[PDB]
């Protein structure tokens, strides 16, 4: 079902990424390898070629929207408030991260209200970790109790793509490939 | 302690003009957009206008001709400049602030002011 | 711009859902959201971005949208949810647009 993820007329908000479990299908990824239309195509602990030849018990398609200028938050070992609050992979990843821009699709005139990421949290995501918390954020050190008061705010923030920025800050699609053997990294058979 | 005191209501001459304010206090009121809404009693909300934690403001077609949104940010204050009033500009008119920071602007976040009622007749 | 139903009544306990017509400037496209109102006090924001949920509202309202619908469904029904509630979403146009309003009534 690569069409419901790469053709989608929308996608996730970075915060609240979607998950689509492929596992079953029959992908040629050399396909996609070869588009052109992928600004982006990084594979982790396995080459583009044989990415059909690894063994796995699941495949995961991930799908958000970013910024261009942090599409390369999106890799194993990447820090900023991206990889650190909204969408974090593991060291040991074994899978492909696809980019494009879709400037036409995603920005809208006066401003997309639309897509959010989050901008605060206490504590860096876990690999994989999904978080769709709307708890006021303690920015000081006087607590908020329950009101967003001087420094304590709603933690999520709009990109607001206008068609006129600057390519680093158009949007792009974004969908990282995952291959999982029982919770660790899937390796070629 | 965060508040939103509007003021600025009462009874207009119809065709005459208005102008309605509000304060804001307990919150970093330069970082947020900020809305004005109007209810007409018994009736549905009715968003009115917008204004950018600077310089981008949008306005409800009912009124696009005649109302004009203003912040000043230095005193913490949205205004709402009001022309032509009609009959049907009768209402109770609340200021809100935006759902974020910056621009979230939109959706409305539930912290409204108290709302003051405008009444245009003679 | 957007229709809603204007009257909806459940008994405590029920399941309600209200309802929300749009068109493709604003449903179609931007999210939808929902407000709480009762009776003349400044309503409060209970669903954003189709379906998520302000802290302290709790999971037994919900958010739906398909097209150029959305729907409010409210589980386990209690007294304390007598009122009006509003969609509200952004039109393209650059508006900005709350439904008519759906008064919902307690009836047991």
């Known amino acids: 079902p690569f069409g419901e993820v790469f053709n989608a007329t929308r996608f996730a908000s970075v915060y609240a990424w979607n998950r689509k479990r492929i596992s079953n299908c029959v992908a040629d990824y050399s396909v996609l390898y070869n588009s052109a239309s992928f600004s982006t195509f990084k594979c982790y602990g396995v080459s583009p070629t044989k990415l059909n030849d690894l063994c796995f018990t699941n495949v995961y398609a991930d799908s958000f929207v970013i910024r261009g200028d942090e599409v390369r938050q999106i890799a194993p070992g990447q820090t900023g408030k991206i990889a650190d609050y909204n969408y974090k992979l593991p060291d040991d990843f074994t899978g492909c991260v696809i980019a494009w821009n879709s400037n036409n699709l995603d920005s809208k005139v006066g401003g997309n209200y639309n897509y959010l990421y989050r901008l605060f949290r206490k504590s860096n995501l876990k690999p994989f970790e999904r978080d769709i918390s709307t708890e006021i954020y303690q920015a000081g050190s006087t607590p908020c109790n329950g009101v967003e008061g001087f420094n304590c705010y709603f933690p999520l923030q709009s990109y607001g793509f206008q068609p006129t920025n600057g390519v680093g800050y158009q949007p792009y699609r974004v969908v990282v490939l995952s291959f999982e053997l029982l919770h660790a990294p899937a390796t070629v058979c | 302690q965060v508040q939103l005191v509007e003021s600025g209501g009462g009874v207009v001459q119809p065709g005459r003009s208005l102008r309605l304010s509000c304060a804001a206090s307990g919150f970093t009121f330069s970082s947020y957009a900020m809305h004005w809404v109007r209810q007409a009693p018994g009736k549905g909300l009715e968003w009115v206008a917008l204004?950018?934690?600077?310089?981008?403001?949008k306005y409800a077609d009912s009124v696009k001709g005649r109302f004009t949104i203003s912040r000043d940010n230095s005193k913490n204050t949205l205004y709402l400049q009001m022309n032509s009033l009609r009959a049907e500009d009768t209402a109770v008119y609340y200021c809100?602030?935006?759902?974020?920071?910056?621009?979230?602007?939109?959706?409305?976040?539930?912290?409204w002011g108290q709302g003051t009622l405008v009444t245009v007749s003679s | 711009v957007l229709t809603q139903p204007p009257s909806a009544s459940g008994t405590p306990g029920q399941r309600v859902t209200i309802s929300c017509s749009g068109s493709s400037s604003n449903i179609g496209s931007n999210t939808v959201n929902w407000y709480q109102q009762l009776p003349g006090t400044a309503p409060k924001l209970l669903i954003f971005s189709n379906n998520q949920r302000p802290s302290g509202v709790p999971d037994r309202f919900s958010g739906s949208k398909s097209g150029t619908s959305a729907s409010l469904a409210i589980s386990g029904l209690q007294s304390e949810d007598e009122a009006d509630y509003y969609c509200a979403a952004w039109d393209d146009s650059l508006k900005g647009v709350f439904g008519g309003g759906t008064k919902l009534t307690v009836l047991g």
């Open positions: 809100a602030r935006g759902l974020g920071l910056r621009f979230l602007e939109w959706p409305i976040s539930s912290y």
């Open positions: 204004i950018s934690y600077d310089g981008s403001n």
